[PDB]
Paper text:
Crescentin is a coiled coil protein that is required for the crescent cell shape of bacteria such as Caulobacter crescentus. Crescentin shares biochemical and cytoskeletal properties with intermediate filament (IF) proteins, which form the third major class of cytoskeletal proteins in eukaryotes. To better understand the relationship between crescentin and IF proteins, and the filaments they form, we have determined the three-dimensional structure of crescentin filaments by cryo-EM. This revealed the full-length structure of the parallel coiled coil dimer of crescentin and how dimers come together laterally and longitudinally, to form a non-polar, octameric filament.
Among the MBs, megabody 13 (MB13), a derivative of nanobody 13 (NB13) binds to both CreSwt and CreSsat at pH 8. Cryo-EM analysis revealed that for both versions of CreS, purified CreS-MB13 complex at pH 8 polymerizes into regular, unbundled filaments upon lowering the pH to 6.5 in the presence of detergents, such as CHAPS. We next extended the box size to ~960 Å (referred to as “large box”) for the visualization of a more complete CreS structure, which included regions that are distant from the NB13 binding site, which was mapped to a segment near the C terminus of CreS. In the presence of MB13, CreSwt, and CreSsat similarly assemble into a “supertwist”-like filament, where two intertwined strands, I and II, are related by a two-fold axis perpendicular to the filament axis. When looking at the map down this twofold axis, each strand consists of four partial CreS dimers (dimers A, B, C, and D for strand I, and symmetry-related dimers A’, B’, C’, and D’ for strand II) within a viewing window of ~960-Å wide along the filament. Assembly of a nearly complete CreS dimer (residues 31–446 for CreSsat or 31–443 for CreSwt) was possible through symmetry expansion, based on the observed partial dimers A and B, resulting in an atomic model of the strand. The resulting atomic models of CreSsat and NB13 allowed for interpretation of CreSwt maps, determined at lower resolutions (4.36 Å to 5.78 Å). The atomic structure of CreSwt resembles that of CreSsat, with only minor differences in regions near and following the stutter. The structures of the WT and SAT versions are very similar, except that the SAT version is slightly longer because the helices contain one almost complete extra helical turn.
Residue numbers in the entry:
A (entry chain M): 297 to 356
B (entry chain N): 288 to 356
C (entry chain G), D (entry chain H): 154 to 216
The structure:
Amino acid sequence: LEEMNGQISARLADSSAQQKAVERRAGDLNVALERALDRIRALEEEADGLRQRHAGVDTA
Amino acid sequence: ETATGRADKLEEMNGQISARLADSSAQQKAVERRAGDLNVALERALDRIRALEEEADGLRQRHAGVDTA
Amino acid sequence: DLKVSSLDASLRDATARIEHLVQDVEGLRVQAQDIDARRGDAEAALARANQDNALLGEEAATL
Amino acid sequence: DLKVSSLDASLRDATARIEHLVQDVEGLRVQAQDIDARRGDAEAALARANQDNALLGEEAATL
């Protein structure tokens, strides 16, 4: 009844608010990976020059 | 009388659209699992970034010493 | 020469997060006021019908 | 040593500036979320009242 009107509101309050939150954190978490993902290989790609510049010198 | 009618209507929609709330929350839970996997990926990527920092440190030392040589 | 090298790390890195999180800062800044677009009309909508439920209460008087 | 000096500027340029924007950002992140939850209490409160609108409504219909 009204308690379940309370409860459906309780879910309405719960579900929508957690809905209002879950993706907003997820969206931050959504944008998050790429910037790590980019620097995951960005450092890796510049790690090559660390390896690149090394070899010839050791040959030298 | 009026309790009977207004209630009957109340239980009806409360039931169906509450289950609706449950289902929409379920897709939200799928989004939650996506976000959590995204998060753990974030920490592991950051740890790899750090390890990259020390590894490049090591590359720099093994560049410098042989330069000296 | 170790000194110049090893200390080169953070300056590039910290700028990156400066380049990283600040962009997020103005990014998540307007995020707040974006909701403000949804808030105000709703605030009106709340105002629109909060007074009218008593008006409904007043219509209920026409009973 | 000029670089050992000219490296120092950025390490205080960044860290302080990166000591700057951070405490704002979660603080900014804290406030709006604190704001937003308040929004749901009243925004939905409109609905439940409008749920009570039908109450007087089907009262306005029956009886």
